[model samples]
Target: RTFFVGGNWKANPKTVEEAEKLIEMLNGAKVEGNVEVVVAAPFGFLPTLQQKLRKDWKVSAENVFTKPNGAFTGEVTVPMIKSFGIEWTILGHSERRDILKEDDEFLAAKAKFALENGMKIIYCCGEHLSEREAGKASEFVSAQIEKMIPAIPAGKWDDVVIAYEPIWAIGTGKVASTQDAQEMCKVIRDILAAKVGADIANKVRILYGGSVKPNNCNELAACPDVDGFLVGGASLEPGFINIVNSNVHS
Candidate 1:
């Protein structure tokens, strides 16, 4: 079954009141069982969001360090998020990779850290417009995935979710076509199969991000390889629940 929606609320909102509003909207909304709903809030907001949200709604941290504990004063570890009862973390986002200068090894280390510390990872990999324009989008992302796959143990592979967020499409109002997303997703899966095995690769959920909203969701949902979504801008509204329900009920 498809896993449904995961809303990545990347550093949005300036006050706790807005966070509460986001949670309240979700709590009052109706969603389907077919889809699983996950929301990634800023680390500062996660614990509070946990307190305000419904029991069925899961929460995620936007990012977590690769270590269980560290001297990185500002960094939150995966264990710390897990202790707050936050079940997942989004790692290696384009923002992190491009702006933060995170290489494949660093991301793999983070993925391993999440697994070792008993947290789930939303592992993101995608090409920018430049790479796509260069006709190397698949090659670039495939290498990224390949470099990261070996860091986790084979049995723990299912604990990870992969998000294909093309940088050009993200927040640019340009969503990948259903065909475009599925083709990339399939290539990712195939890479996993070759690196780990067929079973682990097949069972792992691969999500599509980049301007995922209720309008384009159903078509994206229909892709066999596009298992779910990692929503951005649209995630902050009451309509996010509609996207969640769309994945669940059809």
Candidate 2:
């Protein structure tokens, strides 16, 4: 599988000039090996990022509205995003699922609409702390994935990338162990194999995220099932270049 690294600059860097600095830093990084790289930024920055960022590393919107257009005020639609030549989005993320209250069905519809509208998705799923502590983590996550499986249109699996970002690990400076990353990723793969068939399971890229610093990226990259990362803070620094190159270490 081609390694995938997505840099999610979620609601960051208060000014446009800072965004430019980031884009400049990213553009200069010497990427090694073949990796599908995407940088997700705020909607206001989409046009700027799309124009200034390297064509090799594509631009993605942090989220998308289910409708193509009309009547949804304060919502960015798939068509508006597509019009900018943006081809990717991140849905079902823990922040949105928890903070924005986007449930399974809502996320499922967005996935269907976005994919049908010709956008690739970095779909996120994971269990919370209590679920993990209770030892029914897989059971809970399976149900989450089960909710997500059907909404994918036929043949859009190629455009769908799954990310396992456990809720408790995000922004808490707590990262799941390497074994945790590998096992959960493999769990996702097996779930796809059982539900969506082996052909789809084998080709899908499952990424690990949440506090994925450069310090640990190489080790995680070595896991057979850990295709790549949805790098958080690391993607902004020069270390992100290290993280991107870690794909070669694998």
Candidate 3:
């Protein structure tokens, strides 16, 4: 698989003007290496993103509802996103899992619906602080992925991308060490190989989503299992170009 980088602008920038400015910056970025870049933004901004951002890179929705359309107010759905020609989404993010109380079952449903509806996804999984502190990181994350496995329809693994966002490291100024990130990614790959098959495991892109910034991106990119990043704050900055180019360093 080619390197995949997703900039998750999670409800950020405070205004549409700011979002467009950021998009303009990305539009002008000079990409150096072979990378598949996707910029995930709030639902309201998806149209603007798809219309204005560089055509080489794609736009993504931070989330989407399981149903195509329904009485579920305040929720965006797959058909709605697809109607706009949007092709990708992010699901099972730590914020949805931790703060919004989304569970493995809910995430699996979302994954199933998205893939079934012809949209690719960045499905996130990882250990929280308690799980990490108790030294059950692998066991905990494995359970999450295990639940996700059956939800993925046969021959649909190609549309699925997994992101490991160690909850303990997100927004806490505590990034996972390069070794920790690589080891966990390998653990996930091993689990996939055992559960699905080596071919699917080899082709899947596993992204690290823990405080990735320009300063640390090069080193993390060098790690074998660290395919790319699910960047947060830095995605809103000029440094985002550097992170995208880190694949060259790798």
Span of 10 residues, lowest total lDDT, candidate 3 = 168-177
What's the candidate order when arranged by decreasing lDDT? Answer: 3, 2, 1
Q: Please provide TM-scores, in order, for all candidate models, with all chains considered together.
A: 0.93, 0.97, 0.97
True lDDT of residue 55, candidate 3? 90
Error of 1 at 109 (Å): 0.7
Give the residue spans of candidate 1 off by over 4 A: 171-175, 248-250
How well is each residue in 1-250 modelled by candidate 1, as lDDT tens digits? 5575889889887788898887887888867667778889998899898888888878899998878886888888877887888888899999999888988888999888788777878999999877877888879988888887877765677688999987867656565677898888888988888878899888899998767777888888777888888988889877787677666433
Instruction: Report every candidate's CA lDDT.
Output: 0.83, 0.89, 0.91
Pairs with steric clashes in candidate 3: none
Superior by TM-score: candidate 1 or candidate 2: 2
lDDT of 2 by residue, 1-250 (tens): 8999999888876788999999999999999987889999999999999999999999999999889899888999989898999999999888898999999999999999999989999999999887878988888888988988988899899999999997867665666888999999999999999999999999999999766887899999999999999987776678988888889966
Model 1 clash pairs are: 35-248
Count of clashing pairs, candidate 1: 1
Let me know the TM-score candidate 2 reaches against the reference structure: 0.97
The alpha-carbon deviation from the true structure for residue 89 of candidate 3, after best TM-score superposition, in angstroms, is 0.4
